[PDB]
């Protein structure tokens, strides 16, 4: 699907700030939590469960994240090459820091 | 001063839950703690056919995880009850929860 830039940014904002993402099954539970993108007229939304899965799989392929699968759950951990990716995406400076 | 507090102590191990009880009794001299109440153990019981495959005599694996709860009622000020809890010895995997 044409994944919204708002969805994409929230995944990377959660990743840059908390340095960790996760995903469960396709069945939605109010969609994916931890990602609260807003459409300009839209109320605070949650990206469809399918949407976060495709970008993060692509990001694992690029080298943005490293994953360990436990109890049918994803366990992404930020990579340093990924910090450059997310910082460029957020047009951020190196001085800006993740919560660690 | 006299405000009642209901506290619950839950542990998988009887000895580990007993440790918290003995600690609470010692530190309850200062704030007049009530005598402990030992609840009937509520058991999560799973009897499962041991064999992953049906081949073989049907055989049953009996697994039990009885949960032990102890009840504490103190008519004492909140700082005083927090003082008993923080001071009393704490063992990992033991749960203490307070209800007013």
């Amino acid at each position: 699907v044409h994944i919204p830039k708002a969805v994409y940014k929230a995944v990377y904002a959660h990743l840059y700030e908390n340095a960790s993402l996760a995903l469960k099954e396709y069945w939605r539970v109010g969609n994916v939590p931890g990602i609260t993108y807003v459409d300009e007229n839209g109320k605070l939304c949650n990206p469809t469960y399918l949407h976060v899965n495709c970008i993060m799989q692509s990001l694992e392929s690029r080298g943005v994240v490293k994953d360990t699968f436990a109890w049918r759950h994803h366990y992404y951990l930020l990579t340093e090459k990924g910090e450059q990716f997310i910082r460029k995406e957020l047009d951020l400076t190196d001085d800006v820091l993740p919560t660690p | 001063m006299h405000q009642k507090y209901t506290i619950i102590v839950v542990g998988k191990d009887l000895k580990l839950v007993e440790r918290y009880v003995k600690s609470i009794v010692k530190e309850g001299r200062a704030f007049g703690i009530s005598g402990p109440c030992r609840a009937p153990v509520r058991r999560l019981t799973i009897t499962t056919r041991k064999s992953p495959c049906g081949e073989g005599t049907n055989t049953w694996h009996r697994f039990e995880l009885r949960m032990y709860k102890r009840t504490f009622w103190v008519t004492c000020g909140g700082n005083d009850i927090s003082t008993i809890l923080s001071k009393t010895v704490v063992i990992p995997g033991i749960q203490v929860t307070v209800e007013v």
Binding site: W27, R72 | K12, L44, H61, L65
Partner: protein, 50 residues
Amino acid sequence: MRETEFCTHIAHKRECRICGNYNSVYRKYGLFICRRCFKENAGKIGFVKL
């Protein structure tokens, strides 16, 4: 469209928390755990043989 038809709710989907298998999901308590997967992780939970 495929969008409007993909996974229209037809039933509850229940899978072991550890293995994600529909068969023998187990709802006896809060543990939605596979009957075969249960035995392997019974020890970490602490379920023990009498």
